[PDB]
Amino acid sequence: NDLENVKAIAIVYRELSDGSQTVLLAKMKGKGWMFVRGHVRKDEEADPGVAAIRETQEETGFTGMVKQSGAPFTQPGDPQRVITIHPHIVQVVKREFLWVRPSEVRSKLQRAEMIQAWDQLHSFF
Amino acid sequence: GNNDLENVKAIAIVYRELSDGSQTVLLAKMKGKGWMFVRGHVRKDEEADPGVAAIRETQEETGFTGMVKQSGAPFTQPGSKDPQRVITIHPHIVQVQEASKSKDTEDTVKREFLWVRPSEVRSKLQRAEMIQAWDQLHSFF
Numbered sequence: 001n002d003l004e005n006v007k008a009i010a011i012v013y014r015e016l017s018d019g020s021q022t023v024l025l026a027k028m029k030g031k032g033w034m035f036v037r038g039h040v041r042k043d044e045e046a047d048p049g050v051a052a053i054r055e056t057q058e059e060t061g062f063t064g065m066v067k068q069s070g071a072p073f074t075q076p077g078d079p080q081r082v083i084t085i086h087p088h089i090v091q092v093v094k095r096e097f098l099w100v101r102p103s104e105v106r107s108k109l110q111r112a113e114m115i116q117a118w119d120q121l122h123s124f125f
Numbered sequence: 126g127n128n129d130l131e132n133v134k135a136i137a138i139v140y141r142e143l144s145d146g147s148q149t150v151l152l153a154k155m156k157g158k159g160w161m162f163v164r165g166h167v168r169k170d171e172e173a174d175p176g177v178a179a180i181r182e183t184q185e186e187t188g189f190t191g192m193v194k195q196s197g198a199p200f201t202q203p204g205s206k207d208p209q210r211v212i213t214i215h216p217h218i219v220q221v222q223e224a225s226k227s228k229d230t231e232d233t234v235k236r237e238f239l240w241v242r243p244s245e246v247r248s249k250l251q252r253a254e255m256i257q258a259w260d261q262l263h264s265f266f
Contacts, residue, residue, distance in 0.1 A: 009258045013266070014188065014240075021266055022240040025249055029237045032251035035258060038232065058227045059236055061141050061151075061189065070261040075254045087258040089265050095153040095186070097238040098160065099141075104234075105150050110159025113202045117136045117162060117216035120197035124218050125140070125148055 002039035005083050008051040010036035010090040012064060022093055024060065029098060036060070040086065048086035061099070062092035129166035132204075135178035136216040137163035139187060144226035149233055151187065151221075156239060163187065167215065175215035183219050191219035 012024040012035070025033035038055035040048050049066040056064040068089040075083050100108060102125035109115050139151040139162070152160035165182035167175050176193040183191040195218040204210025227233060241249065243266035250256050 009255075011258060011262055013243075021243060023243055023246050023266070025239050025241055025246065026236045029235050033239065033249040034252065034255050054227075055232070057223070057225075058230060058232045060238065061221055061223065061227070063224055068262060068265050070258070073257050073261070075257070085254060085258065087262055089262055092188075093240045094155065096156050097187070098152045099149040099234045099236070100152055101234055102140075102148060102150055105152070108152055108160040111161060113136075113164075113214060114159070114161050116200050116202070117138065117197065117214070120200070121138055121195060121216055121218055124195050125150070 001041050001043075003042055003045060004039070005081065006040040006045070006048070007037055007083060007085050008040050008048045008055060009085055009087040010052040010056045010064065011087065012036055012056055012060065012062070012090045012092055014092045016093075024092075026059065035087075036090075037085075049088050052086070052088040052090055056090050056092070060092070064090035064092045067091050126170045127168050129168055130172060131166075132211060133167040133172065133175075133213050134164055134215070135167050135171075135175045135182060136214055137179040137183045137191070137219040138217065139163055139183055139189065139191060139219045139221060141221040141223065142226060143229040143233060145229045147229045153186070162216075163219075176217055179215070179217035179219055190222045192222060194218040194220050 040051040044051045053064050066088050070087040072086050154160050163186050167178040171178040197216045202212050
């Protein structure tokens with residue numbers, strides 16, 4: 001269902017109450033940082049912005065709206081592989097965040113207080 | 126009324142539901158001991174229902190609109206820098222509200238996230254592809 005060599009990048013930001021903006025960066029847990037990226041589906045070929053919005057929600061949980069679409073650019077893979085990237089600005093501070101499957105939460109907790117909260121409520125999941 | 130209770134806190138275990146019924150849980154840590162759920166003080170006018178504090182703190186810390194799905198009995202912990210201090214903690218499950226549910230793929234977990242100011246973005250990018258995207262679009266900010 002994905003186009004193998006066509007990707008979308010979402011530069012995700014939000015406006016704060018004091019009128020300023022902040023930009024979301026990501027990395028795979030475990031280079032520096034990156035924006036949101038994903039393959040464009042075949043049924044998204046005609047509007048890659050739809051892919052940028054879908055990927056933003058998949059990765060972050062926020063629903064977004066394309067504010068600007070940049071010109072496509074090409075990058076190598078296999079150096080013969082040519083990937084076409086469609087970049088977009090997508091509008092949706094102190095802490096770093098991470099989404100985790102429930103079976104992996106306990107291994108991330110090191111504080112007694114957090115472990116106690118999880119011990120009382122984990123059977124919801 | 127909206128003054129914080131010094132020794133009463135709410136914890137929110139924030140989660141989202143994916144379209145197939147799978148669930149993922151949000152963790153956080155101060156940039157720079159492990160990970161943690163959302164935590165903050167309960168206000169005087171929230172003491173009768175600390176779930177209100179859990180919803181408020183979730184919004185403040187993450188930007189998500191949440192709904193309380195479950196809340197555990199209160200538990201007690203000592204003060205972090207004072208063993209005489211007694212803190213009562215009210216833990217909650219809080220579901221992130223979304224217009225539509227995302228597909229369950231491995232894109233939905235194992236990515237660490239950080240919000241930065243536009244002026245800090247470039248120094249965190251190391252890959253040509255990301256730098257190119259930023260070079261084309263940074264004039265928006």
